[PDB]
RNA sequence: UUUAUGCUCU
RNA sequence: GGAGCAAACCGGAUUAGAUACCCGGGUAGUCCACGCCCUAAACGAUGCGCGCUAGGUCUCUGGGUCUCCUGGGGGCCGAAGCUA
RNA sequence: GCCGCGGUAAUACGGAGGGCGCGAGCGUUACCCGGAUUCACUGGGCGUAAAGGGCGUGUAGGCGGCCUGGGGCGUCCCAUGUGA
């Protein structure tokens, strides 16, 4: 299925702290604090003027890695974004963000995108009252994201819900902290998000 | 203030009694992404020296690039030597579609939306000189009417 | 002899503008004027006037060029950068109204003969007709 | 005053080049008799008018003019008429690049200074008898070519050419630099590439002295106080 | 007015 | 029909060989009539017709109010443009 | 796969560590289209790159000067039927 195993090799192969971690990629070691270079035996050697293709590849990998998604799915969406009328570039990002496993992370129900994924695929999530265990369910302006019933306990939740007090969630979102529930209000504008990504190069990638 | 992206570095070689004598050539693009570009081709006995004087000439050859929302006014087709470039304007929200050579230029001059195709000779040197002349020939409804009126 | 009188004209012009002549005579014709007419109305020529060479009907056409430029090759731009027959005698070209061209994204004219006279791309789209597509100019 | 009457322009200043022409010289031609093309002087006036209308303007704003005349008929009539206006000129061979390569051609002028500032000074006699004649010989020719070019340590904003054909190099040389080109030209050359034209005889001292002289005057009038006639009727005929 | 020829891969 | 020339062929030289190059001979053929053959670097390696786009000079051949103009050919240099 | 690697220091062979790309799939072979404006209607050519017929005469065919009417075949417009 989705990728598994070593992650800090990505935190740092793309060469940009991208917070695939929980609280660690925040500590004085996303692994990227200690060793800010590519993994493996050659990470400490002098880089070569990258190939025009290489740059578009690394970028695509970066973004695609952030959401921890499979290329099978990652392009499923890019093609959708292409067809759909819009700015294509930013349209794409909206679709990636509209994912359940991503929302649940943006709403801080869980710390990591991967923690947020297991949370959905276990029943510890509910949409508009219904049980929803599909890390791909696309949410639209108006839905009621929320923690389930039998799941209102579990130190994991309230421990992570607490650390949410102080943090202001992005515009397109909202959260009733005390009640455990958010709402997908709108489709996140480009400006609304500052991904370390140049989405232009990701489009220039699939234009073979 | 300016931006330098070079597309071509190559090693030519003359011939003299006892060995081949080399020399280098660099194609450099110079722009501001605000509507100004320049193409310079410099050659020197070593890579950097040539790259350097490339930019030199690069600014010795500029051009108005009448943008229109990161695109161009009309569609234009231009030929240099046996090489040919087709510039068709795309609607904002598309992207710059071109090869490595025509892209580097169209980018360091603004243009974030444009459709293009190289025809005839895909030779880099000549395709570039053809793309500049292709921009150098663009006209807007403004300069269009400043032509057709009388007096 | 001449197979295409119209094309010939357009070419006579294309050749004068290249050497920057003030004008050029072209064997006259009713239809050949209607077109020459539209070239002045759209400001591609200063206009024309019926004349008589050796007692034969002609049409002096007064060309327009841009201002003397500076730097090497100090030669004016061109009011008529481009002009060529579409529909030829060897291959007639007829387009329905929905099928009308778009010369240089509106920046250029697209003369074309319709059952309501010699019109232009827009001028014809206004009437909403279409017909034989004489030539394109910019 | 400034102007000229078609009276004095009756010496020999209306034609010279027969069927040796440049057909682009249409507007400025009247009729071919005695084989030779006789150039219409009436239009010479109109252009001589419009021409000065740029010279005078340029003069009374401190603009410089560079003189080029390598012909035989138009050599001396420049060395004087130029200095008499405190302007730079070219008398002998026209070194290629002088403008497009002013940067490096000048480095050869600083040498002139450095040679002048070594005539009879605290160091010369210390140098061998062999090198002396040598160093001074490098000066002799050094000044021969760069005498009039010496002035102006910066490229001008116009040049005055005796024959845009004999000096095709310069005309285009400057033309590439956006440097306005003004010249005297008979049927030898073509207009088009001249910015301010003086359509008249470019051979025969008579015309080169008449039209170039009272042209140097119109310069000082916009400068300050036109003097009296200057070196002209030398070995004149 | 006498000459012809130069193994294989770099 | 056949003088000169000359594939083939013979001889003399040359050469390692010399069925070649050079030399001496020499038959078809080269020539004419008639009838076939249909090839070619059959070349400007550039199909034909018509209109349009500076000129300079040399030449052949017409007409001219015979310094020059005009028409049709044959060459060179060349505007603009074309061309790897 | 194409250019090409191996001749005792091989990033090109074999294994290894490491890395890159995809992931219940990953490769391979075969075939179609694309890139190929490389059959060019859009959108190519023919002096020397492949390409002007050895030259004429001419059949069918293709194309065809200026002006004015008639017809309305092409063409254009609208309406409508059909286009499951
Ligand atoms: Mg889109
Ligand atoms: Mg595509
Ligand atoms: Mg071509
Ligand atoms: Mg090719
Ligand atoms: Mg190639
Ligand atoms: Mg042998
Ligand atoms: Mg050998
Ligand atoms: Mg052997
Ligand atoms: Mg081998
Ligand atoms: Mg023998
Ligand atoms: Mg023997
Ligand atoms: Mg023996
Ligand atoms: Mg031999
Ligand atoms: Mg014999
Ligand atoms: Mg014999
Ligand atoms: Mg036989
Ligand atoms: Mg045959
Ligand atoms: Mg022959
Ligand atoms: Mg051939
Ligand atoms: Mg021919
Ligand atoms: Mg034929
Ligand atoms: Mg004759
Ligand atoms: Mg006669
Ligand atoms: Mg002739
Ligand atoms: Mg020639
Ligand atoms: Mg030329
Ligand atoms: Mg070993
Ligand atoms: Mg080894
Ligand atoms: Mg080795
Ligand atoms: Mg390999
Ligand atoms: Mg290996
Ligand atoms: Mg490994
Ligand atoms: Mg491994
Ligand atoms: Mg498979
Ligand atoms: Mg075609
Ligand atoms: Mg081809
Ligand atoms: Mg042809
Ligand atoms: Mg051959
Ligand atoms: Mg032939
Ligand atoms: Mg042939
Ligand atoms: Mg034939
Ligand atoms: Mg025939
Ligand atoms: Mg017939
Ligand atoms: Mg007809
Ligand atoms: Mg017919
Ligand atoms: Mg009729
Ligand atoms: Mg219907
Ligand atoms: Zn980390």
Query: How far apart, in whole angstroms, are the C-alpha atoms of residue B108 and residue B34?
Result: 8
Q: Specify the length of chain C in residues.
A: 138
Looking at the DSSP bridge assignments, the partners of residue A99 are A138
Please state at what angle helix B124-135 crosses helix B100-107, rounded to 10 degrees: 40
Distance from residue B14's CA to the centre of ligand 9 (Å): 29
Instruction: Give the architecture (CATH level 2) of D7-94+151-237.
Output: 3-Layer(aba) Sandwich (3.40)
Measure CB to CB from residue A52 to each of B93, B100, B112 and give the nearest one: B100
- CATH node for C81-138: 3.30.1490.10
The gap between B46 CA and G25 C1' (Å) is 51
Query: How far apart, in whole angstroms, are the C-alpha atoms of residue D68 and residue D165?
Result: 12
Q: Quick one: closest CA in D to C70, which residue?
A: D178
Query: How far apart, in whole angstroms, are the C-alpha atoms of residue B4 and residue A206?
Result: 26
DSSP letter for B89, please. P
**Ramachandran bin of C94, using left for φ above 0, alpha for ψ from -120 to 50, beta for the remaining angles:** beta
Fold of D95-150: Helix Hairpins (1.10.287)
Give the right CATH number for C3-80 from 3.40.50.10490, 3.30.1370.30, 3.40.640.10, 3.30.70.20: 3.30.1370.30
CA distances from D176 to B35, B45, C77, D180, D194 (A): 24, 27, 18, 10, 13
* Cβ neighbours of D178 in C, within 8 Å: 70-71
Query: How far apart, in whole angstroms, are the C-alpha atoms of residue B22 and residue A208?
Result: 35
Same domain, B79 and B129: yes
Q: Is the CB of C102 under 7 A from strand G?
A: no
Q: What are phi and psi of B77, to 5 degrees?
A: -125, 125
The gap between A195 CA and G48 C1' (Å) is 61
**Do the domains at D7-94+151-237 and D95-150 have one common CATH topology?**
no
CB of B71 closer than 8 Å to CB of B41: no
Q: Do chains B and D touch (3 or more CB pairs under 8 A)?
A: no
Own/partner pairs, B143-147, CB within 8 angstroms, 24+ separation: B144/C107, B147/C43, B147/C64, B147/C66, B147/C77, B147/C79
Same domain, B38 and B80: no
Q: Which of A51, A52, A92, A190 to mutate to test the interface with B (most CBs of B within 10 A)?
A: A52
Same domain, B69 and B143: yes
Count of domains for chain B: 2
CB of A67 closer than 8 Å to CB of A18: no
The gap between D218 CA and E1 C1' (Å) is 85
* Cβ neighbours of A54 in B, within 8 Å: none
Q: Is the CB of C55 under 7 A from strand G?
A: no
Q: Do chains C and D touch (3 or more CB pairs under 8 A)?
A: yes
Closest CA to A15 of A2, A32, A33, A28: A32
Query: How far apart, in whole angstroms, are the C-alpha atoms of residue D164 and residue D195?
Result: 11
Experimental technique, in short, is X-ray
Query: How far apart, in whole angstroms, are the C-alpha atoms of residue C110 and residue B133?
Result: 25
Q: Specify the length of chain D in residues.
A: 237
* CATH code for position B55: 3.30.160.20
Query: Any idea which nucleotide's C1' is nearest the CA of C2?
Result: F50
The ranges of chain C annotated as CATH 3.30.1370.30 are: 3-80
Same domain, B106 and B116: yes
Domains, chain A, ordered by start: 1-96+194-208 (1.10.1050.10), 97-193 (3.10.290.10)
In terms of residue numbers, what domain contains B58? 3-63
Q: Which residue has the tokens 């909202």?
A: A174
Same domain, B115 and B83: yes
Strand ranges, E, within chain A: 126-127, 130-131, 144-146, 181-183
Domain boundary among B63, B89, B105: B63
Query: How far apart, in whole angstroms, are the C-alpha atoms of residue A31 and residue C70?
Result: 62
Residues 61-120 of A with CB under 7 A from strand G: 61, 70-72
DSSP letter for A167, please. P
Q: Which SS3 state, helix, strand or coil, does residue D155 take? A: coil
* CATH code for position B139: 3.30.230.10
Query: How far apart, in whole angstroms, are the C-alpha atoms of residue A202 and residue B116?
Result: 19
Domain boundaries, chain D: 7-94+151-237, 95-150
CB of C78 closer than 8 Å to CB of C137: no
Own/partner pairs, A34-41, CB within 8 angstroms, 24+ separation: A36/A12, A37/A12, A38/A12, A38/A13, A39/A6, A39/A9, A39/A12, A39/A13
Pull the structure tokens for residue B103: 């892209």
CA distances from B73 to B53, C85, C106, D146, D205 (A): 32, 24, 10, 51, 56
Provide the edge-to-edge strand list for the sheet that holds B83-88: B76-80, B83-88, B114-120, B96-97
């Amino acid at each position: 299925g989705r990728y598994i195993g070593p992650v800090c090799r990505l935190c740092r192969r793309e060469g940009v702290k991208l917070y695939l971690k929980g609280e660690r990629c925040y500590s004085p070691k996303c692994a990227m604090e200690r060793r800010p270079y590519p993994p493996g035996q050659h990470g400490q050697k002098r880089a070569r003027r990258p190939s025009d293709y290489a740059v578009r590849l690394r970028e695509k990998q970066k973004l695609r890695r952030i959401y921890g998604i499979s290329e099978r799915q990652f392009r499923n969406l890019f093609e959708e974004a292409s067809k759909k009328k819009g700015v294509t570039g930013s349209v794409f990002l909206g679709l990636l963000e509209s994912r359940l496993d991503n929302v649940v992370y943006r709403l801080g129900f869980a710390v990591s995108r991967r923690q947020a994924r297991q949370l959905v695929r276990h029943g510890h999530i509910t949409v508009n009252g219904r049980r929803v265990d599909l890390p791909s369910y696309r949410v639209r302006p108006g839905d009621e994201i929320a923690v389930a019933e039998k799941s209102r306990n579990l130190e994991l939740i309230r421990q992570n819900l607490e650390a949410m007090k102080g943090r202001k969630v992005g515009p397109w979102l909202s959260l009733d902290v005390e009640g455990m529930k958010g709402k997908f209000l709108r489709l996140p504008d480009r400006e609304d998000l500052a991904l370390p990504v140049n989405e232009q190069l990701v489009i220039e990638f699939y234009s073979r | 203030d300016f931006e330098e992206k070079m597309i071509l570095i190559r090693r030519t070689a003359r011939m003299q009694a006892g060995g081949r004598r080399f020399r280098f050539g660099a194609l450099v693009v110079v722009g501001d992404r605000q509507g100004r570009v320049g193409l310079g081709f410099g050659k020197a006995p070593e890579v950097p020296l040539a790259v350097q004087k490339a930019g030199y000439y690069a600014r010795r050859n500029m051009v108005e690039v009448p943008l229109q929302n990161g695109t161009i006014p009309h569609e234009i087709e231009v030929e240099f030597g046996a090489s040919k470039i087709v510039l068709k304007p795309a609607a904002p929200g598309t992207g710059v579609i071109a090869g490595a050579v025509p892209r580097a230029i169209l980018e360091l001059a603004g243009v974030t939306d444009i459709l293009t195709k190289e025809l005839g000779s895909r030779n880099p040197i000549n395709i570039a000189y053809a793309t500049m002349e292709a921009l150098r020939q663009l006209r807007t409804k403004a300069d269009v009417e400043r032509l057709r009126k009388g007096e | 002899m001449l197979t295409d009188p119209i094309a010939d004209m357009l070419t006579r012009i294309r050749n004068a503008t290249r050497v920057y002549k003030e004008s050029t005579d072209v064997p006259a014709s009713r239809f050949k004027e209607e077109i020459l007419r539209i070239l002045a109305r759209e400001g591609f020529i200063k206009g024309y006037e019926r004349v008589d060479v050796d007692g034969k009907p002609y049409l002096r056409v007064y060309l327009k060029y841009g201002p003397r430029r500076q730097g090497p090759d100090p030669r004016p731009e061109q009011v008529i950068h481009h002009i060529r027959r579409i529909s030829k005698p060897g291959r007639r070209v007829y387009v329905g109204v929905k099928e009308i061209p778009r010369v240089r994204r509106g920046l250029g004219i697209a003369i074309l003969s319709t059952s309501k006279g010699v019109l232009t791309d827009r001028e014809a789209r206004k009437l909403g007709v279409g017909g034989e597509l004489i030539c394109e100019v910019w | 005053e400034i102007t000229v009457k078609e009276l004095l322009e009756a010496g020999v200043h209306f034609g010279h080049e027969r069927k040796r022409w440049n057909p682009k010289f249409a507007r400025y031609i009247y009729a071919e008799r005695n084989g030779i093309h006789i150039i219409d002087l009436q239009k010479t006036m109109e252009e001589l008018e419009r021409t000065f209308r740029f010279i005078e303007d340029l003069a009374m704003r401190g603009g410089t003019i560079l003189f080029v005349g390598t012909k035989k008929q138009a050599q001396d009539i420049v060395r004087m008429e130029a200095e008499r206006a405190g302007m730079p000129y070219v008398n002998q061979r026209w070194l290629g690049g002088m403008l497009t390569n002013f940067k490096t051609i000048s480095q050869r002028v600083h040498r002139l200074e450095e040679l002048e500032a070594l005539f009879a000074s605290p160091e010369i006699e210390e140098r061998p008898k062999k090198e002396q004649v040598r160093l001074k010989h490098e000066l002799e020719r050094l000044q021969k070519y760069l005498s009039g070019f010496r002035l102006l340590k910066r490229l001008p904003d116009a040049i005055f050419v005796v024959d845009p054909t004999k000096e095709a190099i310069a005309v285009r040389e400057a033309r590439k630099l956006f440097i306005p080109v003004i010249a005297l030209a008979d049927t030898d050359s073509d207009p088009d590439l001249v910015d301010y034209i003086i359509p008249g005889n470019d051979d025969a001292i008579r015309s080169i002295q008449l039209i170039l002289s009272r042209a140097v005057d119109l310069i000082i009038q916009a400068r300050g106080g036109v003097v009296e006639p200057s070196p002209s009727y030398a070995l004149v005929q």
